[PDB]
């Protein structure tokens, strides 16, 4: 068992903050770095993934009318509706190969090891998402990146959010069929409290013992370094504070 | 003729939508978006930069050699971005 940092950092009220501190903690990893586990919340938001334009995706008048942040990651899939009821976590990690097939099956099976704890019976999940059977919800959806050197995995899990939100952000060919996903998402998604009474902290620290039993490691927390909060307002400042960004126009680094 | 259309598609894992551009038979400009994973990620505006100008004929060609470059592109193949990006 080595050791690793536990990093409980989040700006609920700043998504777009949010997701830059993911990318400045994986963008200044070196290898051989003691690895990262995050945990977050974000307050009301759609988050779009790398390859995605806002426009295509989501409402953007009906987020603005109820206050719902648009923002978009760094890694693919994948538009989420997040709130205060979705445990965030990301694992960065030193990596010596490209397999992230093998880390994205490694995550689930720590998930999984995770909601054992908690007395219920998880199942991976193809690729990406974790569900409880039922004939299965899906509870939680994830994503990553690579690069040599590190890898970045990370995760929502659906503690007590309201699943009607889910649908009510997504972008409908003809609003006739508003109904036919919205029917169909309920159907296929869940929240943890359906299932077994916990609180977000309790699903969280299951998360930090079967994190640190399946992967070997240690996780003490620890605080920000200056060079990852420099990255971070950096990345805030130039990319993830911009329209441009957000609306999935720019796809380019501007470090 | 001048021609521009928009497709979604169903993948195994994701949704590629593509928007092309066509003046006859050569691509005027193309937008690849939507939900999949490509690394690494910035090769999908190699994928547009290879497509735009080439012939909406010699499609195949342009999706094979980008691949054969070496791009890992999760729950997508290869055939998945001929389908997405095929008209006729």
Avoid: C
Avoid at chain 1, 109 to 119: D, M, P
């Amino acid at each position: 068992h080595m050791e690793g940092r536990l990093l409980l950092l989040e700006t609920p009220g700043n998504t777009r903050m949010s997701l830059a501190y993911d990318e400045a903690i994986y963008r200044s990893f070196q290898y051989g770095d003691k690895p990262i586990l995050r945990f977050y919340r974000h307050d009301r938001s759609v988050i779009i993934g790398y390859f995605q334009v806002a426009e295509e995706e989501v409402d953007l008048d009906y987020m603005k009318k109820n206050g719902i942040m648009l923002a978009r990651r760094y890694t693919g899939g994948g538009a989420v509706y997040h709130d205060l009821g979705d445990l965030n976590f990301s694992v960065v990690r030193s990596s010596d190969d490209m397999d992230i097939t093998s880390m994205f099956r490694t995550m689930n099976e720590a998930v999984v090891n995770s909601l054992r704890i908690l007395g219920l019976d998880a199942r991976p999940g193809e690729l990406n998402d974790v569900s409880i059977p039922v004939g299965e919800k899906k509870i939680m959806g994830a994503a990553g990146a690579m690069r040599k050197g590190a890898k970045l995995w990370h995760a929502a899990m659906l503690v007590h959010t309201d699943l009607d939100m889910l649908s009510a952000v997504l972008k409908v060919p003809d609003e006739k069929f508003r109904d036919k996903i919205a029917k169909s998402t309920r159907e296929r998604v869940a929240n943890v409290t359906d299932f077994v009474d916990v609180s977000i902290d309790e699903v969280r620290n299951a998360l930090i013992r079967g994190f640190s039993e399946t992967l070997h490691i240690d996780f003490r927390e620890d605080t920000i370094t200056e060079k990852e909060e420099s990255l971070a307002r950096e990345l805030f400042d130039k990319k993830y504070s911009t329209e441009e960004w957000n609306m999935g126009l720019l796809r380019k680094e501007v470090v | 003729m001048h021609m521009m259309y928009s497709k979604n598609w169903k993948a195994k894992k994701g949704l590629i939508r593509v928007t092309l551009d066509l003046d006859g038979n050569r691509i005027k400009d193309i937008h690849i978006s939507g939900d999949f994973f490509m690394f690494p990620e910035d090769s999908i505006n190699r994928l547009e930069d290879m497509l735009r100008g080439s012939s909406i004929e010699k499609i195949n060609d342009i999706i094979r050699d980008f691949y054969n470059q070496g791009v890992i592109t999760p729950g997508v193949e290869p055939e998945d971005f001929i389908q997405a990006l095929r008209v006729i």
